[PDB]
Amino acid sequence: FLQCLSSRIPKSIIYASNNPSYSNVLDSTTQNPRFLSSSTRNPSVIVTPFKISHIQPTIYCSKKHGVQIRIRSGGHDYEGLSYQSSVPFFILDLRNINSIQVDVEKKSAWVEAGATLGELYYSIAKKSKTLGFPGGLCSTVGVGGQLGGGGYGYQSRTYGLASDNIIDAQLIDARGRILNRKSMGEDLFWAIRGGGAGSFGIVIAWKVRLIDVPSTVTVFETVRMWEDNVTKKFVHRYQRRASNIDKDLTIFLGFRTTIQIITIISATFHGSRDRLLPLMQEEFPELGLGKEDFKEMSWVQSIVHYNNYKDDDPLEVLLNKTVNFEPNPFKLKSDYVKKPIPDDVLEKLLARLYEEDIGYDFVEFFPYGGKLSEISESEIPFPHRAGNLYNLRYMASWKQGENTTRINNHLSWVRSVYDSMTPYVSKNPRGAYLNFRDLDIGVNPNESDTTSAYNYVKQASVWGTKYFKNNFYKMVFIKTLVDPTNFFTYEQSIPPILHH
Numbered sequence: 001f002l003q004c005l006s007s008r009i010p011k012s013i014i015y016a017s018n019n020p021s022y023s024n025v026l027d028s029t030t031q032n033p034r035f036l037s038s039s040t041r042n043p044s045v046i047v048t049p050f051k052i053s054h055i056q057p058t059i060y061c062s063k064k065h066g067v068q069i070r071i072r073s074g075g076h077d078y079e080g081l082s083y084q085s086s087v088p089f090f091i092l093d094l095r096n097i098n099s100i101q102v103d104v105e106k107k108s109a110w111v112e113a114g115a116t117l118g119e120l121y122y123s124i125a126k127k128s129k130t131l132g133f134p135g136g137l138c139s140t141v142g143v144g145g146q147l148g149g150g151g152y153g154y155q156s157r158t159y160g161l162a163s164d165n166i167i168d169a170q171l172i173d174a175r176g177r178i179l180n181r182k183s184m185g186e187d188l189f190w191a192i193r194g195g196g197a198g199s200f201g202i203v204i205a206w207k208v209r210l211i212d213v214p215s216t217v218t219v220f221e222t223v224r225m226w227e228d229n230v231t232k233k234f235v236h237r238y239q240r241r242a243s244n245i246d247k248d249l250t251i252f253l254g255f256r257t258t259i260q261i262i263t264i265i266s267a268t269f270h271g272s273r274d275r276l277l278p279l280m281q282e283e284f285p286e287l288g289l290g291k292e293d294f295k296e297m298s299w300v301q302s303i304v305h306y307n308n309y310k311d312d313d314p315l316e317v318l319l320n321k322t323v324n325f326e327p328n329p330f331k332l333k334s335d336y337v338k339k340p341i342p343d344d345v346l347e348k349l350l351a352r353l354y355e356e357d358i359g360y361d362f363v364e365f366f367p368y369g370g371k372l373s374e375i376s377e378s379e380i381p382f383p384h385r386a387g388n389l390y391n392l393r394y395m396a397s398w399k400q401g402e403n404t405t406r407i408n409n410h411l412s413w414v415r416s417v418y419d420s421m422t423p424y425v426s427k428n429p430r431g432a433y434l435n436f437r438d439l440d441i442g443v444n445p446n447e448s449d450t451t452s453a454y455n456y457v458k459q460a461s462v463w464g465t466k467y468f469k470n471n472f473y474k475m476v477f478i479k480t481l482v483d484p485t486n487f488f489t490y491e492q493s494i495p496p497i498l499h500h
């Protein structure tokens with residue numbers, strides 16, 4: 001494999017195990033610290049192209065020598081699939097493929113896969129205070145992965161997901177052909193906008209629609225005690241109102257221990273605080289929030305704020321490539337909720353936070369509705385639309401270095417929490433969020449360990465219909481057309497219809 005690469009691409013973009021910088025390049029975007037001790041995080045080579053023509057030979061060498069491709073842009077995949085495999089593999093790391101072209105007059109931008117959300121937001125904000133992009137929250141996330149999987153954040157109720165706002169793309173397929181929207185066709189251009197683009201090809205660049213944002217947005221955040229009847233009433237009404245209120249207001253909810261359970265309420269309102277005050281006093285008067293609890297800022301300042309930087313920090317903090325906190329290993333799972341959880345079941349859920357160490361486990365609510373209930377189930381592969389109140393996320397975290405038995409304890413905790421919620425969350429299929437990737441919901445069999453093509457597809461649909469509902473089956477046909485030999489494979493790759 002390595003011989004084939006070195007006779008075809010410059011040595012300067014090739015990092016093998018023997019290279020002293022291999023470990024830095026590997027670790028630099030291993031973004032879930034849980035996998036820093038994974039035995040499957042051992043690519044034989046990391047390739048870091050700096051121009052497009054570097055990529056086609058890596059496809060050729062990968063096919064000819066049986067070395068599986070793992071595509072990494074931001075490396076934020078929550079299961080670390082961009083840098084692990086149980087078969088011999090290499091990482092095509094697109095960090096240097098990162099140019100951004102912003103057209104303020106046409107309200108559009110071309111963004112290469114290795115650019116981060118922070119770099120995109122930075123480039124927009126340097127040119128206009130009133131344009132934005134609803135890309136998601138984390139400034140270090142790569143657009144290469146994010147825009148292929150949905151991409152949710154404080155703007156999604158107002159403007160849609162990141163994948164709801166894509167108008168062209170450049171993609172390299174398994175034959176090494178570099179295609180745009182016109183030459184890839186509408187089916188494949190549909191599939192990559194939220195279907196997990198790495199099942200179909202290597203996205204080189206996305207063309208996005210820029211959104212009009214108000215020159216003033218308003219944020220607020222407060223921490224309350226859960227053992228407080230006003231907090232409980234607010235949360236009771238939150239379940240019923242968060243997805244139905246004014247689409248300009250998005251409110252997140254989080255719970256952790258600190259010994260009591262605290263409730264974190266955080267929000268962004270796409271408007272001034274004079275507009276926000278009557279809305280909050282009509283929807284949640286029990287919060288008692290005054291004029292001075294709302295802080296006005298620009299759209300990009302609100303992104304800086306919610307990435308744990310100072311409100312008045314220079315925009316350059318958006319260009320940093322690692323999070324502004326030291327991260328703990330973690331395992332998250334998520335569910336979709338269509339009916340309010342009963343009061344006493346919510347109490348039983350939150351009490352499970354007492355079972356592990358203080359402040360290390362979390363339950364979080366991300367509301368749907370708004371624009372997300374206006375878009376059909378099949379507009380793009382992302383299917384989680386009207387009828388969903390919120391996505392409910394469960395997470396356990398621990399410190400780097402805990403022994404195996406304690407990690408298993410943490411994994412078992414969050415899995416049992418998930419199992420306990422089966423009666424109260426979506427079913428048939430039990431929905432799951434691709435960008436909250438969870439291997440526990442099902443993985444592919446080894447294609448050689450199936451008994452038929454139908455068998456391969458049906459097994460894969462276990463996880464497939466959870467992420468995509470029946471968009472999964474349209475994606476199976478598209479996969480069959482554009483990658484019939486299954487060059488792009490991994491634990492949750494869309495399967496082709498195998499010929500024999």
Ligand SMILES: *Cc1cc2c(nc3c(=O)[nH]c(=O)nc-3n2C[C@H](O)[C@H](O)[C@H](O)COP(=O)(O)OP(=O)(O)OC[C@H]2O[C@@H](n3cnc4c(N)ncnc43)[C@H](O)[C@@H]2O)c(*)c1C
Binds near residue numbers: 071137204
């Ligand atoms: C670490 C982190 C992740 C976050 C954060 N906040 C999020 C939020 O507010 N909303 C979300 O919806 N997701 C959030 N995430 C998760 C990540 O945004 C998603 O998990 C993305 O999928 C990660 O994208 P990226 O940064 O590129 O990480 P990768 O591992 O490189 O990509 C994930 C996935 O996509 C494939 N892939 C990447 N690049 C390509 C290209 N060019 N072509 C095809 N396929 C590609 C990878 O193989 C992998 O499977 C907040 C934080 C702190």
Ligand SMILES: *[C@@H]1O[C@H](CO)[C@@H](O)[C@H](O)[C@H]1NC(C)=O
Binds near residue numbers: 318319322323
């Ligand atoms: C982010 O960029 C700013 C500007 O240089 C810098 O002050 C800050 O330390 C950076 N954040 C990091 C290194 O996490």
